[PDB]
Amino acid sequence: EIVQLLMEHEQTDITSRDSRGNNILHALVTVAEDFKTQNDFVKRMYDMILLRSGNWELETTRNNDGLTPLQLAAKMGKAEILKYILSREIKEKRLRSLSRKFTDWAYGPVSSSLYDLTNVDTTTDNSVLEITVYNTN
Amino acid sequence: EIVQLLMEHEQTDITSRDSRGNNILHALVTVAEDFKTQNDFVKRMYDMILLRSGNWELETTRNNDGLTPLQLAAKMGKAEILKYILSREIKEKRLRSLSRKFTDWAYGPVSSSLYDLTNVDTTTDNSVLEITVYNTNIDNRHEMLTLEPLHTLLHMKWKKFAKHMFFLSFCFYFFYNITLTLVSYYRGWLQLLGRMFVLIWAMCISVKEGIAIFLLSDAWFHFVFFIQAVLVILSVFLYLFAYKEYLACLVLAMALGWANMLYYTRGFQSMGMYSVMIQKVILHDVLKFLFVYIVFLLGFGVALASLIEKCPKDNKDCSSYGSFSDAVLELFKLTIGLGDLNIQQNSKYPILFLFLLITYVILTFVLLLNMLIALMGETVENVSKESERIWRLQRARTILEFEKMLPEWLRSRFRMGELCKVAEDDFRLCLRINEVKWTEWKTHVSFLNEDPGPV
Amino acid sequence: LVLAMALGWANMLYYTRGFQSMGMYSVMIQKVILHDVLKFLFVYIVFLLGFGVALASLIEKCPKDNKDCSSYGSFSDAVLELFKLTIGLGDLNIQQNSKYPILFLFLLITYVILTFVLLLNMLIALMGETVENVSKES
């Protein structure tokens, strides 16, 4: 409710980066240590916030470490949140641009779940695949 | 309801002590055998009673055995009640003076649960820690120590000093037994000083283990160290004298010491469970096998010897298994797999000889198989759980041994207790802990320190 | 050249990691040789050195101008005999050129027994880790 209030307030700054360089979503990604401890409320908040901000600006940012919150999800052990971020399907035609998980082919129980490889394809200076696989701890 | 009535009556005597010296709370502590059997109603009664009596008088009492109900819980196996006795938080500002579990720092899911160490800090003639750890006839000591304050005390002390002392003693003993090896292998001025150091260190450990025995199988090591040092001093005595037995006792003590090295291997976590496995194996599993193997050995040995009793024909080499000891030696050699298997000479019944031998082999093999099957059955469960618990117990016992070895002033400097103020001019010693809970969101109305931060 | 050759034939296991079954097999090899065995080898070796110096000291009696008359003469030779016995090839007999033959035999037997129970316990620890960690972690 308070999040709804703040994002309804005009003086709010959504894209504000902290002294550590992190943004809102970066914090949440630091926060979700495990599914059992929090009963998975954070994914709901991530979803609500992205639905309340229809831009790619947030996911496009980099912290002072030079990493996307997705890249930060890799640098940490965030798993369920990552399952949500990669598997993201939106029926809303206004915000459908955001959903990475597409479904373009379906005759019945069979379907084509089409996914997005932008920063994952091992192309631009790092990748979720490379980052994770070469990560430690 | 009846309790409410009685405590509402003025003629009641709450502090009344029995012919045994116990009071109300002592009795409940005697009766809390298990959570499952009683469905945990006693904790509720303890709580209601303390809330009906706003004084420290009861828990400050001592029985005729000279023990608080808390100390009585330690001498007993009461666990669930004890978690309440230590972890006690009261939001009521009138009775808040009683609660030992304080929470002075909270910004969110993070908080500081501050606990009280009054009788637990190993200070006043006994303590819950010392009492529990040195207690016997209680198998619940593990769950007792899994609690927050005691566990964190042990860890804080290990990170303070004890690890240094453990590695230190390990180094001393290492150099000691190594010097002993050099001596035993080579038998100027350096050797004399080394021998003097050996005598001194041996006297030290010998007197330590002697005092330990006087204060007296988890303690199996003490007697072993004692026997070692005894054999050492005996070797020294016989060395000076014109005797041939000095080498024997010396060597025996040396090998015994290299065996005692396992006790120092008990330090490491994995090696700890490993050594616990050693002790458990050699205690439970093997002894049956060895006893019964030995009686089999004696039987088949006398059998073979009797058959072999045929005349050697003036040649010892012609007669194998002639001496009973030689026959037993051949059998054990065979069980190893070096034995000499052959059609016997100077024998009346070679067939029966062979058959009895084969039967001994087969029986030994299946017997080995059965110590193995018993081993696996016990291990599948006892291996993981019992190892960690018993290991931590041993760790705690040794830690407290080191802590009791030290004087008061050094102890006073190494105290993990940090004093903290509490309402009503109540000053008490405490151990700060910081924990987190992500599930239950409960606003903190009761907190001592206004400014939420480590300062 | 030879040592590198044998080291390479050992490195062949790394290529065995390709196959699914042999993959989990090689993972089991690595996990075993890392966790289980090192404890056994360290503690075995210290036992070995102790009982070795023991046997050598007892054997320190004069060989009588005959090296063959003195077994366990060199510490390395004694340790060799002990490991040979653990294999099961050792020569067990009443020792000559010895002051305390009974003590010698007893120390030897104790070494055997300790080694055996020790082996049994590493096997215990192995199984205890294998019940769960074998399948999934592999």
Curated annotation (Swiss-Prot), chain B:
<keyword id="KW-0040">ANK repeat</keyword>
<keyword id="KW-1133">Transmembrane helix</keyword>
<keyword id="KW-0109">Calcium transport</keyword>
<feature type="transmembrane region" description="Helical; Name=S5">
    <location>
        <begin position="269"/>
        <end position="307"/>
    </location>
</feature>
<feature type="topological domain" description="Cytoplasmic">
    <location>
        <begin position="266"/>
        <end position="268"/>
    </location>
</feature>
<keyword id="KW-0472">Membrane</keyword>
<comment type="function">
    <text>Non-selective calcium permeant cation channel. It is activated by innocuous (warm) temperatures and shows an increased response at noxious temperatures greater than 39 degrees Celsius. Activation exhibits an outward rectification. The channel pore can dilate to provide permeability to larger cations. May associate with TRPV1 and may modulate its activity. Is a negative regulator of hair growth and cycling: TRPV3-coupled signaling suppresses keratinocyte proliferation in hair follicles and induces apoptosis and premature hair follicle regression (catagen).</text>
</comment>
<keyword id="KW-0406">Ion transport</keyword>
<feature type="transmembrane region" description="Helical; Name=S3">
    <location>
        <begin position="219"/>
        <end position="239"/>
    </location>
</feature>
<keyword id="KW-0813">Transport</keyword>
<dbReference type="GO" id="GO:0046872">
    <property type="term" value="F:metal ion binding"/>
</dbReference>
<keyword id="KW-0107">Calcium channel</keyword>
<dbReference type="GO" id="GO:0009266">
    <property type="term" value="P:response to temperature stimulus"/>
</dbReference>
<feature type="topological domain" description="Extracellular">
    <location>
        <begin position="308"/>
        <end position="319"/>
    </location>
</feature>
<dbReference type="GO" id="GO:0007015">
    <property type="term" value="P:actin filament organization"/>
</dbReference>
<keyword id="KW-0458">Lysosome</keyword>
<feature type="transmembrane region" description="Helical; Name=S1">
    <location>
        <begin position="156"/>
        <end position="185"/>
    </location>
</feature>
<feature type="transmembrane region" description="Helical; Name=S2">
    <location>
        <begin position="188"/>
        <end position="216"/>
    </location>
</feature>
<dbReference type="GO" id="GO:0007231">
    <property type="term" value="P:osmosensory signaling pathway"/>
</dbReference>
<feature type="transmembrane region" description="Helical; Name=S6">
    <location>
        <begin position="349"/>
        <end position="385"/>
    </location>
</feature>
<feature type="topological domain" description="Extracellular">
    <location>
        <begin position="346"/>
        <end position="348"/>
    </location>
</feature>
<dbReference type="GO" id="GO:0098703">
    <property type="term" value="P:calcium ion import across plasma membrane"/>
</dbReference>
<feature type="intramembrane region" description="Pore-forming">
    <location>
        <begin position="320"/>
        <end position="345"/>
    </location>
</feature>
<keyword id="KW-0106">Calcium</keyword>
<dbReference type="GO" id="GO:0042636">
    <property type="term" value="P:negative regulation of hair cycle"/>
</dbReference>
<keyword id="KW-0407">Ion channel</keyword>
<keyword id="KW-0963">Cytoplasm</keyword>
<dbReference type="GO" id="GO:0043235">
    <property type="term" value="C:receptor complex"/>
</dbReference>
<dbReference type="GO" id="GO:0005886">
    <property type="term" value="C:plasma membrane"/>
</dbReference>
<keyword id="KW-0915">Sodium</keyword>
<dbReference type="GO" id="GO:0005764">
    <property type="term" value="C:lysosome"/>
</dbReference>
<feature type="repeat" description="ANK 6">
    <location>
        <begin position="65"/>
        <end position="87"/>
    </location>
</feature>
<feature type="topological domain" description="Extracellular">
    <location>
        <begin position="240"/>
        <end position="244"/>
    </location>
</feature>
<dbReference type="GO" id="GO:0042802">
    <property type="term" value="F:identical protein binding"/>
</dbReference>
<feature type="topological domain" description="Cytoplasmic">
    <location>
        <begin position="386"/>
        <end position="455"/>
    </location>
</feature>
<feature type="binding site">
    <location>
        <position position="337"/>
    </location>
    <ligand>
        <name>Na(+)</name>
    </ligand>
</feature>
<keyword id="KW-0479">Metal-binding</keyword>
<dbReference type="GO" id="GO:0070588">
    <property type="term" value="P:calcium ion transmembrane transport"/>
</dbReference>
<feature type="transmembrane region" description="Helical; Name=S4">
    <location>
        <begin position="245"/>
        <end position="265"/>
    </location>
</feature>
<comment type="subunit">
    <text>Homotetramer. May convert from a homotetramer to a homopentamer to allow pore dilation. Interacts with TRPV1; may form a heteromeric channel with TRPV1. Interacts with SNX11; this interaction promotes TRPV3 trafficking from the cell membrane to lysosome for degradation.</text>
</comment>
<dbReference type="GO" id="GO:0005737">
    <property type="term" value="C:cytoplasm"/>
</dbReference>
<dbReference type="GO" id="GO:0005262">
    <property type="term" value="F:calcium channel activity"/>
</dbReference>
